[PDB]
Design a protein around this ligand. Sequence first.
Ligand code: I9K
Ligand code: I9K
Ligand code: FBP
Ligand code: FBP
Ligand code: FBP
Ligand code: FBP
Ligand code: OXL
Ligand code: OXL
Ligand code: OXL
Ligand code: OXL
Ligand code: K
Ligand code: K
Ligand code: K
Ligand code: K
Ligand code: MG
Ligand code: MG
Ligand code: MG
Ligand code: MG
Lengths: 425, 425, 436, 422
Amino acid sequence: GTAFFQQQQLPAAMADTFLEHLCLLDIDSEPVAARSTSIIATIGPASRSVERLKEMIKAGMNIARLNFSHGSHEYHAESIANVREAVESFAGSPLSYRPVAIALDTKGPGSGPGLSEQDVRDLRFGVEHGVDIVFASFVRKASDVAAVRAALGPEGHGIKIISKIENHEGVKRFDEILEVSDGIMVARGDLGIEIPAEKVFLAQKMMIGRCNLAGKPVVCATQMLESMITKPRPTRAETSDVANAVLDGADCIMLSGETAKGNFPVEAVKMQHAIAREAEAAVYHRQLFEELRRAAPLSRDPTEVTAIGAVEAAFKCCAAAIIVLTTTGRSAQLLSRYRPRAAVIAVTRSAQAARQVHLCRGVFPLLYREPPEAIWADDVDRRVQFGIESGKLRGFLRVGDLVIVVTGWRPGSGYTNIMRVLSIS
Amino acid sequence: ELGTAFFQQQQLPAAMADTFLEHLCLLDIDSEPVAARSTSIIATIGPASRSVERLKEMIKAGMNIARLNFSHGSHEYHAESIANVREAVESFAGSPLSYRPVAIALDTKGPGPGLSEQDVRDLRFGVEHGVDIVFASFVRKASDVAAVRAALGPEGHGIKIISKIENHEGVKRFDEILEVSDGIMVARGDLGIEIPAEKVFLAQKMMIGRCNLAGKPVVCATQMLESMITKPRPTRAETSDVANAVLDGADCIMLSGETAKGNFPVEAVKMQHAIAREAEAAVYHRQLFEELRRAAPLSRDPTEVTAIGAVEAAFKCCAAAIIVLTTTGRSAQLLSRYRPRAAVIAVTRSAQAARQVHLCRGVFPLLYREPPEAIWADDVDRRVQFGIESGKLRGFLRVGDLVIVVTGWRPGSGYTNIMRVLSIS
Amino acid sequence: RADVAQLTQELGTAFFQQQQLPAAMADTFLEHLCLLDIDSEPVAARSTSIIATIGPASRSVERLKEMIKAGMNIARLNFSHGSHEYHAESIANVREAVESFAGSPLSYRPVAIALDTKGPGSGPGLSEQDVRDLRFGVEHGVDIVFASFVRKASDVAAVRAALGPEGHGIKIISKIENHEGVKRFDEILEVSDGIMVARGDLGIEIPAEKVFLAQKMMIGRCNLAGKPVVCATQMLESMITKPRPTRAETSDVANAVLDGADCIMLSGETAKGNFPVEAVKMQHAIAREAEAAVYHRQLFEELRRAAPLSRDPTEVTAIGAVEAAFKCCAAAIIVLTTTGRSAQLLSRYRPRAAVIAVTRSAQAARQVHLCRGVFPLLYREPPEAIWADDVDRRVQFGIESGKLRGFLRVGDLVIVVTGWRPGSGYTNIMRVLSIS
Amino acid sequence: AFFQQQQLPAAMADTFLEHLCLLDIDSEPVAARSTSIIATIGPASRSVERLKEMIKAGMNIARLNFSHGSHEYHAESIANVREAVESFAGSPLSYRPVAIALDTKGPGSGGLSEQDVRDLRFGVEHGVDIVFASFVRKASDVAAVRAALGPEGHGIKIISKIENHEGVKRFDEILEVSDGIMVARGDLGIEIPAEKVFLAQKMMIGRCNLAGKPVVCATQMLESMITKPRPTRAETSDVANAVLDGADCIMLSGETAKGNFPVEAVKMQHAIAREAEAAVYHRQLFEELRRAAPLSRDPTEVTAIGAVEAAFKCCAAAIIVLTTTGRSAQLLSRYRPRAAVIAVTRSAQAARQVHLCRGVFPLLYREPPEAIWADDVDRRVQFGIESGKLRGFLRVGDLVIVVTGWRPGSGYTNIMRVLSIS
Ligand SMILES: O=C(O)C[C@](O)(CC(=O)N1CCN(S(=O)(=O)c2cc3c(cc2O)C(=O)c2ccccc2C3=O)CC1)C(=O)O
Ligand SMILES: O=C(O)C[C@](O)(CC(=O)N1CCN(S(=O)(=O)c2cc3c(cc2O)C(=O)c2ccccc2C3=O)CC1)C(=O)O
Ligand SMILES: O=P(O)(O)OC[C@H]1O[C@](O)(COP(=O)(O)O)[C@@H](O)[C@@H]1O
Ligand SMILES: O=P(O)(O)OC[C@H]1O[C@](O)(COP(=O)(O)O)[C@@H](O)[C@@H]1O
Ligand SMILES: O=P(O)(O)OC[C@H]1O[C@](O)(COP(=O)(O)O)[C@@H](O)[C@@H]1O
Ligand SMILES: O=P(O)(O)OC[C@H]1O[C@](O)(COP(=O)(O)O)[C@@H](O)[C@@H]1O
Ligand SMILES: O=C([O-])C(=O)[O-]
Ligand SMILES: O=C([O-])C(=O)[O-]
Ligand SMILES: O=C([O-])C(=O)[O-]
Ligand SMILES: O=C([O-])C(=O)[O-]
Ligand SMILES: [K+]
Ligand SMILES: [K+]
Ligand SMILES: [K+]
Ligand SMILES: [K+]
Ligand SMILES: [Mg+2]
Ligand SMILES: [Mg+2]
Ligand SMILES: [Mg+2]
Ligand SMILES: [Mg+2]
């Protein structure tokens, strides 16, 4: 229909130049796709009640950040419990259940050179309490990441390490840090104090671009809607900043004081949700996909190979979604790196992976709870049908839509290799 | 894993180039072609190439399609030629390494207002003798194609109609002619007489580009190696012309007097084979694929959607081949339209389709003769392995190579929707 | 590397590390972002003009002198507040502070004066207060009018009519503040001299989360049209009370420049803020960083692909001059202009070289601040008897001022844009000159 | 109607593929033929009357193959060429200069052969403009030819013929020290596999285009026309593709030296080149040439790109350039403008040598210098406009780009002007 091609900035996406693309942006072109940039919300006095946390999950919060610079282990354990209670209050309807990751933000070293003793204690707390992500403060070199990995021990092997770049050394040794990290956070608060305030946008734009190139999650953090700590609506600069972090290529956007101690924590999440949707529709996918494709090296990994084929096929048919079966979340991450306009609906039995895929832009995790079928092929089809039913319920899909289904040839992680074009019935 | 020596062959340094100009600068005479020759050779069969023994040498030299010019000879004469071609082709039906299906094409005499009386009789002859292709002479408008289609009696509806564009009206009505034809022949002999000789290259380049855009086979014909009718080696202009027809985007190249009446018919086939191999390696796939992609409209046909995904995946891993199961040849044709550097090995039970897919650049047909398995999925795997083993048998594949496998979800033509990444074992 | 090998040997590796030159050489936009370096210092003069709203915090002649030194190019008078007596006093103080530097014409900085109207209201036709304020502007010699709540092309015609016959030289920058203005943008831009993205009212009239779409669209269309575009409101809002801005604020300013804005504005930050000089200094610091980070390779190519063929020698000379400047890494493009049009046409192709515009018109020298990358020089000498000699004196004035202000150094290449006969509309010559 | 001619719909295309699709056989070429024709002079094309027909047909350079004939024979040919050329000198607004090129025999089993030294000394004594040096294998071979030309032969252009595998492999070092290259396909097709010659041709042309140096495509281009009045489909294709490859010059060997239709062969190359030049995808070409060309601090280099850019912007009919040595015109030519580069020069040798550069139309200025240098410059610019108007390049109302310098002499080009005709 003609009405379909007027929505989600499709006239601006068809443009032959980036300049023409900007000229074609329409304020009356409504976003249709689900919001793909994840929202990380910092937990605190303003956002700890189980009832408040339920409203924040409904508003769009995907990751709950526990800032270990404040409060005790007793405090942070109560936080975790409330978050888990609010998340599990929706587990009765598995077709609409939304998993929420739990991230531990470390205090950092200070006048010291290596992992603080407090950081070791907090890291072991995180492992003991089952945190999904670690935002490692003041990462200056690759050995800092290794020290955090060591402090997580053998049981914390599944936790994701997102290195916070907060100073000039971190920016200068970025490549070696990214290589050993699972992703990066652009920690603008300290970065804006350690380097000239007028140079932070260069570091942000550079780090996001390099993470996009590497296929690793990148978080944009600090003062994004700061005025919403006290004021019910944000400034013109604030909405612009959020929209531009998405347009830069950020996988996640964050709320610090806006959710931890503010008067508008649910309003702050709803505002980030509203802006991200508008900004994602305004992304110039034509140039973006082409540049991501050109820059990405040749691969002999079937998962990587299937991922680019699936993304290419999704663009060809205007696929509503790409449904992927994933154990560790890697298959979904590899789809996400090519920035498809189609939602990546990731069906997994791993609750940890379902929470951790929120770090990847455009990945919508679905936790499958049914016990395995005797016939493996039947188990696969049940999980694909689960993705279709959830996607239909949540508005991602309609009868007649085309979806790309990404699966593998045998059970267990590492074997994705099949891409099938599917019509929704 | 592949080695530096691999990346020096088949003009891979020139293929990596960021500009077309840099691409030309990087062409290396010492970079040997490795891939199988993808541009099919059409050889006109006449007194010089009629004998079963001569035809066997021509099949070994690279002839894929045998052309019978109904402007000369009789029905009795051409039926003898067809019988000899079929006898020479079936002499290799024992050894799968030597066996190659060869299409049989009837070139009509031409019209007068509408279809000639002789053309109706010759077209009826073609149907009765089971010809695969018709090169319809002097096609001027879409009604001419319809008249040929109508002449291909009740039994001839599967024959391919390749419209010969030989005059100014055919060039001017090209779009309407291509829409109703299976493909086009750039009939340069008459075209060089009907229009100024210095304008024929414009018509050739335009028609090839439009056929490439449409995804339909295009043949470059007449005087390609003319001097070789009397001389053992061609001129500098002749080798250039053949190389440039391939670089233009031609699916097939033709030999007329060179094979029909000349003194070196086998040498002419060998020469076209040698040049096509060099020219195909020198194709700038980076710009070509990107432009084919950008120009091709969005599609909701799973076959077309799977085809672009498969070609994308093949480029990503330097896939040795794309093995496709096809009944009509459509699935292979849709892969071919995106000009992959990988060979399209099409496994089919249809002998007609196996001969007709020679019209498509880079399609290597394999006729499957085994009786159907009780389990359809098992019948499918047996055909995929038939593809793989013959591939290994001919030097396309080695254990450890990556291949893209294109199949459908249910039997019968029209359901192609699966793309798998398989490692050769 | 071969496209810069000899020039790298000549200018030095240190030259090619500064002003984001490694990021500018990138083959893709993505690679360009990856190559941005915080250690790559900006060298070029700041090209995006700063508009500062003058109020109680920034009225004193001594304060205004510090703001001119900080980088203020245009002084804005908001006729929504204050009186005619109040605003006339502000204008007088601005003029006094500007003329305090007129003693050295090689370092004198012209400052434009802009009147921001109050706007219509519940009623549509030009308000009676607007007619009185527009008459005031004409009488006081304002250079620009920021026309509030422009909704259609007839609105801009009504403002031009209220300016009268004597206000023909004033520039009309239409403020787009509502949904109607955004929807009828093309018709408004056609009849306006430029546009202001009035984000304050725009953020109230349309959803706050959609304003960035309107900003990016309007800037792109103004860039396409070759007309000045201003980004306004809440750019450094927190600096009204604090000495340092938020991370979102510095980002917003940098992104307005990267979007393609010719001018950036300060409202409450300079009118009623506690740190008006610090706000100007902050916008100056960010704009310089952001201009160096512009991906000129794609930008110039897209401006050329989009721009239609032209048979106007001024337009033709402008693209040739910008192309030549990119080829040699020209330090500046010196242009002789009467109305500012020749400089405006150079500016539309977004050169990295500074457009040093030499003019005898004081009004045009102030008005060219609306054009990104145009550095106006007011020529005060009386005309030479030989016209060709008068032209060469003005070109030499530009070279001497350029050398004086640090724009030029011996050995630099400059592109000189002049015409074949006196008077406006005859620009058609481009020269490559080496600085001695 | 203007935008339907000279493949302008195909030139507006956003992709190369769309460009090919838009090529129109009914779109007539309007601009003058840019690719120069080199004709080998022999028994079939030696008469003064024959040579006059060949000049009118389009011959720009006359080649004398020193592999056959004697010094007495070739001197007679030179005299006949010069006589036929000077028969049109009466009308200087329509006079067409013709270069004279000596093609050496080569070293054969050997450094520089003794016959080559004698022939090179002959060329210097007879005032040849170009030398096509046979079998150039390395940079020292070029130096040996340069040395054999001596002090009197400093002005002669050396076009190195690449005829074997060593020449192809050491191409970069040879091009660096040569004025240009000839893709000598006859010997190349024997020295390397026949099916690999197109790779060497396309590579050499691209590299010469990149370097801004003339490249000639030679041998068997219209071979059948030695005995037949019309060429083959492959032959017309080959000529059109040499132009589309980026060749500055195309050559005729046996076709003009010993063939039955030498004038018809020249006419045929002229007809095809015109069609092929209009079909060039300038959008991609200029952009790639622009991107690839290095940054320069030479005002001639800088003015050249500005002039070509300005010409594309207004659909300039021509770019009129004042040149002493031909360098300023050569630098304009390297950016492949669609506008004709009308080069006004007082040097007769430079006027002949500029035929090596594609799209450069030399005009020999034969008026004595004015007292005021600025007035002398304007007279030469007006000469270009009058000759252009006469030859059909210009019409009143057209826009032209005028490229001049700030001071007399060679190496000072730095000015570009936009001028409206009449
Ligand atoms: O259109 C119209 O008709 C025109 C046209 O095209 C033109 C011409 O004439 N030609 C060309 C071609 N060729 S070749 O040599 O190649 C050839 C041969 C032959 C043939 C074929 C061919 O093909 C056969 O079959 C035969 C049969 C039997 C016997 C013999 C024969 C022979 O020889 C010829 C001549 C025609 O006619 O067709
Ligand atoms: O290089 C090396 O050595 C090679 C070679 O060279 C090769 C050959 O033989 N050929 C080729 C060429 N051709 S054409 O025709 O063109 C020609 C002819 C002529 C000429 C030239 C030319 O040129 C002259 O001069 C002359 C002179 C005198 C007399 C005569 C003549 C003639 O005819 C021939 C043949 C040898 O082998 O030897
Ligand atoms: O993204 P990952 O972790 O590699 O997991 C993908 C895996 O999931 C599957 O699709 C299904 O396997 P399971 O039945 O074990 O869930 C495999 O075929 C594939 O290896
Ligand atoms: O290219 P075509 O003619 O559509 O044939 C492709 C068909 O072949 C298959 O892959 C296998 O089908 P069959 O088992 O009938 O051969 C189908 O699933 C698919 O629709
Ligand atoms: O930019 P504008 O307004 O067209 O003015 C440029 C004009 O200035 C000149 O360079 C000098 O002219 P003046 O004698 O009027 O100062 C003219 O040649 C040209 O027409
Ligand atoms: O083309 P060349 O050899 O580099 O020199 C071109 C020269 O032509 C001129 O425009 C006119 O020079 P002349 O006065 O020597 O004829 C010079 O200013 C310029 O240097
Ligand atoms: O740690 C952070 O979030 C910061 O410093 O911005
Ligand atoms: O039939 C042909 O091939 C022709 O006419 O060129
Ligand atoms: O009018 C204004 O300045 C605004 O709305 O921002
Ligand atoms: O000398 C030549 O021209 C050749 O050998 O091709
Ligand atoms: K912390
Ligand atoms: K026929
Ligand atoms: K106001
Ligand atoms: K010779
Ligand atoms: Mg911090
Ligand atoms: Mg015919
Ligand atoms: Mg307002
Ligand atoms: Mg030779």
